[PDB]
Amino acid sequence: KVFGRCELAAAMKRHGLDNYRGYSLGNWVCAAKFESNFNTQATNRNTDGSTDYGILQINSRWWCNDGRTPGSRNLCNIPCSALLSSDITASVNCAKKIVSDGNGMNAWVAWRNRCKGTDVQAWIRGCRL
Numbered sequence: 001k002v003f004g005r006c007e008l009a010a011a012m013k014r015h016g017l018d019n020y021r022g023y024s025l026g027n028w029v030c031a032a033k034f035e036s037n038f039n040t041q042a043t044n045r046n047t048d049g050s051t052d053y054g055i056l057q058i059n060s061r062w063w064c065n066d067g068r069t070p071g072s073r074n075l076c077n078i079p080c081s082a083l084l085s086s087d088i089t090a091s092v093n094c095a096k097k098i099v100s101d102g103n104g105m106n107a108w109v110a111w112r113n114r115c116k117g118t119d120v121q122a123w124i125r126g127c128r129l
Contacts, residue, residue, distance in 0.1 A: 005033075010128070010129065015089060016096075024121070026124045027105060030120050036057055040085060058098070060080050063076045
């Protein structure tokens with residue numbers, strides 16, 4: 001599923017992400033935009049052989065099991081395919097564990113290079129709330 005901007009904003013808010021660990025909702029919608037272009041089925045293979053899945057591009061090296069990343073961990077205790085669903089619940093609950101691990105939203109390279117210290121409030125501007 002390809003989410004609209006405000007649609008995704010409302011869904012992430014309803015799943016408890018606005019201001020989760022201090023990160024306002026605009027941070028999360030900006031990171032989804034540049035990670036996946038709001039597309040739940042996005043997948044991208046990394047050079048070490050691991051693969052990123054879903055709207056927030058959660059990596060199989062640490063967070064999910066895809067059966068083809070040797071020596072990786074499954075810290076969110078989920079098949080990686082659950083991250084591609086049109087319902088964002090598994091992506092959001094795994095993302096909550098990742099942002100709580102010490103590095104905050106720097107774990108997402110596109111948030112770090114393209115969202116961090118920008119006016120992220122603009123990503124939820126106009127949205128019904």
